[PDB]
Design a protein around this ligand. Structure first.
Ligand SMILES: Nc1ncnc2c1ncn2[C@@H]1O[C@H](COP(=O)(O)OP(=O)(O)O)[C@@H](O)[C@H]1O
Ligand SMILES: Nc1ncnc2c1ncn2[C@@H]1O[C@H](COP(=O)(O)OP(=O)(O)O)[C@@H](O)[C@H]1O
Ligand SMILES: Nc1ncnc2c1ncn2[C@@H]1O[C@H](COP(=O)(O)OP(=O)(O)O)[C@@H](O)[C@H]1O
Ligand SMILES: Nc1ncnc2c1ncn2[C@@H]1O[C@H](COP(=O)(O)O)[C@@H](O)[C@H]1O
Lengths: 288, 288, 288, 288
């Protein structure tokens, strides 16, 4: 295998060939149970849909209340590569008005942007009255992919970790409600999903040069993740941390978290349910 | 009862009360067959999803070919209110990369924009290399909703009809491939969809005072549609015109049309299928 | 007089008619010496031109140093209406490259802009590598003209005073050198300059309804000045405060200040000269 | 002595060393009379200022009329390097309100801009109601500096020549008044000004590597000028062509031309005077 990589999965030497259509047993058997996942089987499709429908009905109410009051929301999505960021975003926006809820998904910075204040091109996307803005990756590029891949210098990395709390304090002081979600998955789950994307012609667009590099960089991402959650989890900018091995439970609890934190007119606490504390936690210390 | 309207439906007076949860039989019985619709029943869902999957797999190939060549695509979506243009956009973008495929859904112009060249704020959204940009409504606001609702003057309307072909001639000469889709529905189908949206807590966001006002302005929108298709169907900017009573057949044939017109790498004509000529036609005079 | 205003000049009732082409003696004879001005006559024109020329030669060096190193500079100009903000900006940019030094002169916020984070439209103007950005009025609109005329609420005013220091902390931590200049003049000098502009067909455009109304708001503007200087003079964003009764001395010492604070290659200490401490001071308490 | 270039001056080899402080007599003696210049001596300095003052008083009237009517103006400035475009722009804007009259001086395109429609980044600077926008260079980069220096391909060059008339047809049809000014100078005048800029510490910022390369490329620019004037001078976008050897006469007739073409309230034709038809002509053929 040309793209096959060697990996150290706790003392054990493993080879992963993403192009091999056959998934080996040590990934197949451990993918769902990795990352101390609390559930034995994934949430059934029809129970997920019944619950998600009820949650999206509540988000329609949220949007109506935001147009009426002018309230603005920003929701940041980050995590392990292949953890399910885009799916949590689509589950949130599926039944929202595209003229008042929009997704930010920026590309690599231009020469002009690289010479700007790092946050400038993100401020350009900030919401006006009533808008719900969701970030498919965010300024937290500089706390993960950029230092791991050397797209920013160590000093730029250290600088970003000191400025992000200041940036988000202004956001919160302005009255924009800022959500930050870190969607985690276990190591073998990431391998399984890279394999799934590689061998599905409908999903192979999800598999980028970055992800193939992320394979040998698991521990470095772990370090950057831990460092980032500990140093940028502040009162003004709290991190909600998700065990995301089950995409369905991930999406449901992301949305439950936002509904509970918003004091929107018409809110039906029965339809929201409870955030599963086994799936969604706060700040550092949630992931072992 | 507070918003019931009296309508003239092909010679007879009819009452439509959108807030009445019961749909009148004269709407429910005629909605699907309205607008000379060529089929007796809905396309089967399972068949539709199987076909949509093959089309989205081709759209992955399209996006790969656009990235490698730099080719750019713009897809304009217009039509009768409630004809499902957002549904056609989601079916196109569901498995495309949000960093290279994006949706434009502008809100009403600010005072600054109203004093600008009408087209300026649309040029601001134009694609860079490899981008696929989809317009959920477009500069064709000024050929429909604006003149019907008096948001632009008649001089401004007549000016737009003359200037849009010149605008699209420059788009086409730049080598951006411009698709324009008009999705039609029959009058009874519009009422049924308005009613369904009003009484579904998940879809009530899809209604707006613009829609509410469109109830009493059917014949006005008809003439604005005819005038616009006549005056702005050109070689450089041709209109693809859709009988959209069946949302599944609408979405499939929209995507098939684009796949047929794009000469992309890896194109599988057997997977694409044939554009259904009973559903998708060209220019003025296809619809009655 | 159609728009004559009655004023109280230290317990004495005075009447100022700006449309009267005759300036009264009490304005003409006290204009230059108001605000405890330290010099008895205005600076000799030839000496001013010789000095400004040397100073603009140093600014040429500054611009070359900024292109090579990438250093970015922002210069904010606020003051009494008619104090000479544009003249200080023109003296600074007269021999600078328009592609790397630019002036920001925003108009009143659009509806979209009013629903945004107040600072958003100002971040959009921030410099990329090498750029010198000057603000002909700035975000400090909300600490002066906006509360005085009621274009913002008391709550928005108090919020700005808390947030402007945090905003400029981020600017300073980014390594953009931010200058802030308050150009003060005496009351009678303001009256004289309004009069001069009213009766000069070349300068009448400088007279706006905001200035006509400022005629009666002298004391209100005084309090806003004092409050804003004390609460937004910080280590990260220091205020330079200028006695501006003499436009020539105002322009020279503004530029001297910036030349002294920038550590640019080729700095000719002898060319810069001494900042006149009788003209330019730091922070509150300089004016009285 | 480093970057001396050999030039062919109508049958003779000449050496020009821009770094030599002494200017050769063959340049000095021919500079003002070059380009079939029709006057023996430059315009009297005090007479120029008196005329310019009266023209700028007329431009105040223009601005007030544009504010009241919403009328918009765009003024494009191109010409030989060192012809004085920036000087003509400052003479127009010196006594205009910088909140409604603004200068566009774009830098080289980003990667993103290079993948866009060439005109898109210029459309982003178009005027809203009442604005007067001046271009210090324009989209005509692609008919001059870009093809001469190889920053665009021949296909892109030919495409621009065909598309610029279509672009300006839409500008004119929109009711924006578009002026295009080509400021020409003689070859020895250009060498003289280059030499003057190089050896004046106040103006050396006016030189660029682009200017240095222009030295050896005079004949290329001559053809590029003539092609552009022939192919893009149209009814909707006419070129005003200036003999600019005397910068005072260039500035005055540029402004006179605009005042003549604008039907503004309070127009005083005696103040405007007559455009000097020996200095300012129309389209190709005016220049040798
Ligand atoms: N050369 C680069 N410099 C800075 N950021 C980059 C660079 N290349 C990729 N990125 C960013 O890293 C993140 C991951 O990139 P990629 O995997 O290629 O696409 P996606 O995130 O959509 O899956 C993106 O936000 C991307 O813009
Ligand atoms: N006052 C207005 N002036 C101009 N355009 C308007 C105005 N109000 C609404 N519109 C436009 O009419 C179109 C239909 O409005 P709406 O139904 O709310 O959007 P949507 O397509 O998402 O349902 C939108 O493009 C909207 O911007
Ligand atoms: N209605 C308003 N709301 C907010 N700001 C305003 C409003 N009107 C004027 N301003 C601002 O007050 C400042 C003074 O403007 P003005 O005196 O009218 O003209 P200028 O600043 O060009 O001399 C400007 O920055 C202006 O944008
Ligand atoms: N590498 C480049 N590519 C395209 N345009 C450029 C490039 N370099 C300079 N220019 C443009 O050429 C013109 C001359 O530059 P300057 O003399 O520096 O004003 C300006 O419009 C520049 O933006």
């Amino acid at each position: 295998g040309s793209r096959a990589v060697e990996l150290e999965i706790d003392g054990r030497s493993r080879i992963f060939d993403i192009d091999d259509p056959d998934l080996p047993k040590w990934i197949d058997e451990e993918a769902f149970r990795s990352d101390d996942y609390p559930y034995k089987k994934k949430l059934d499709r029809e129970e997920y849909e019944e619950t998600l429908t009820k949650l999206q009905i509540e988000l329609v109410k949220v949007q109506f209340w935001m147009q009426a009051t002018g309230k603005r929301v920003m929701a940041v999505f980050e995590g392990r590569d292949a953890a399910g960021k885009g799916g949590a975003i689509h589950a949130t926006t599926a039944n929202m008005n595209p003229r008042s809820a929009r997704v930010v998904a920026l590309t690599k910075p231009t020469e002009t942007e690289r010479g700007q204040w790092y946050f400038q091109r993100y401020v350009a996307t900030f919401p006006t009255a009533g808008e719900f803005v969701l970030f498919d990756r965010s300024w937290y590029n500089r706390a993960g992919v950029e230092p791991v891949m050397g797209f920013c210098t160590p000093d730029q990395y250290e600088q970003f970790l000191k400025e992000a709390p200041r940036f988000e304090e202004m956001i919160a002081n302005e009255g924009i409600h800022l959500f930050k979600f870190w969607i985690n998955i276990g190591r073998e789950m990431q391998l399984k999903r890279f394999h799934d994307r590689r061998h599905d012609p409908l999903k192979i667009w999800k598999l980028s040069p970055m992800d193939i590099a992320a394979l040998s960089k698991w521990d470095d991402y772990t370090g950057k993740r831990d460092r980032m959650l500990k140093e940028t989890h502040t009162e003004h900018g709290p991190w909600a941390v998700i065990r995301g091995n089950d995409k369905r439970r991930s999406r449901i609890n992301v949305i439950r978290h936002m509904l509970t934190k918003l004091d929107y007119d018409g809110k039906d606490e029965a339809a929201i349910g409870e955030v599963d504390e086994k799936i969604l936690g706060s700040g550092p210390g949630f992931l072992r």
